[PDB]
Paper text:
In some pathogenic microbes, the response to oxidative stress is controlled by a SirTM/zinc-containing macrodomain (Zn-Macro) pair responsible for establishment and removal of the modification, respectively. Strikingly, however, the “catalytic loop” found in all other MacroD-type enzymes (also termed “loop 1”) is replaced with and extended loop containing the zinc-coordinating Cx(4)HxC motif, here termed the Zn-loop. To gain a closer understanding of the functional role of the 3α-bundle and coordinated Zn2+ ion, we solved structures from the three sub-branches of Zn-Macros namely from S. aureus (SauMacro), Methanobrevibacter oralis (MorMacro), and macrodomain-fused SirTM protein (Mfs1) from Fusarium oxysporum f.sp. cubense race 1 (Foc1Mfs1) in their apo form as well as of S. pyogenes (SpyMacro) and MorMacro bound to ADP-ribose (ADPr). In all structures, the Zn2+ ion is tetrahedrally coordinated with three metal-coordination residues within the Zn-loop, while the fourth coordination-contact is exchangeable and is provided by either ADPr, a water molecule, or a symmetry-related protomer within the crystal.
However, our data do not support this binding mode: first, the different orientation of the diphosphate-binding loop in our apo structures shortens the cavity, which would sterically hinder the binding of the dithiolane moiety. Surprisingly, neither MorMacro, which arises from a minimal operon containing only the Zn-Macro/SirTM pair, nor Zn-Macros derived from Msf1 fusion proteins could demodify SpyGcvH-L. In contrast, all Zn-Macros could demodify Glu-/Asp-ADP-ribosylated PARP1 E988Q. On the other hand, the absence of positive interaction surfaces in the other family members of the Zn-Macro family (having neutral to negative surfaces) might provide an energetic barrier to GcvH-L binding and explain the absence of activity from these macrodomains.
Author numbering: 0 to 259
The structure:
Amino acid sequence: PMNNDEQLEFLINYLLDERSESIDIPKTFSEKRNLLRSLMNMRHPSNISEEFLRIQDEFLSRETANKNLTSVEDISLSSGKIMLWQGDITTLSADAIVNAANSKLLGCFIPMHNCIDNIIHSASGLQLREECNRMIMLQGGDEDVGKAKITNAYNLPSKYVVHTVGPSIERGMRVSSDDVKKLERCYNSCLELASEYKLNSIAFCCISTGVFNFPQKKAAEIAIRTVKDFLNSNETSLNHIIFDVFTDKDYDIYKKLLFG
Ligand SMILES: [Zn+2]
């Protein structure tokens, strides 16, 4: 019964066999780990060995348990039902985390790319892309901006992942009212679906910032307002909405707006 390094070798070797190739297995653990992520990032969704899945799960679950995990009650920075936390969303045991997805909803196919979509899929497992693929098959095509779908979170410490597609801003364009309205719809759709599943806590990433080029201050102002308007006007199971920010800049913006 394999150790941690044998599990990692096994997973890498299986994915390389599937491609009919062979690179030289890197030296350092962290090199091989990055090879695994790349291989996972690129795998188009399809039937896969259950032996692989079992080993993937032991491997990724153990990785999850060796991170420093955060529970919702550990977050000290809060205003009523709203919380603000700077940290890695794959280490937060909210009922649901929000994935800022794209319209194909299969995650990120670019190896090592450090968008949240990539990071979430990398830590969750290949099953997340598969579950997403099925919801695409069933609806008969691509996901529109401003909606929300819920999946299992697999080897993350959260129970569910909620996938939403935000608007993108053309380079050098000002944000328009259409753009704002779409981003409000992302937040609301997430909040409504979480309410319908009776979740207690949900964590948002900064939807549409980064790759989709939405300006960070305006995005925050919209995220905060939409969440607040939703809480002020619905009876909801939700008691904790967490704004999970990764950058120092996002932290400073949300902090000033919520507490400053
Ligand atoms: Zn990406």
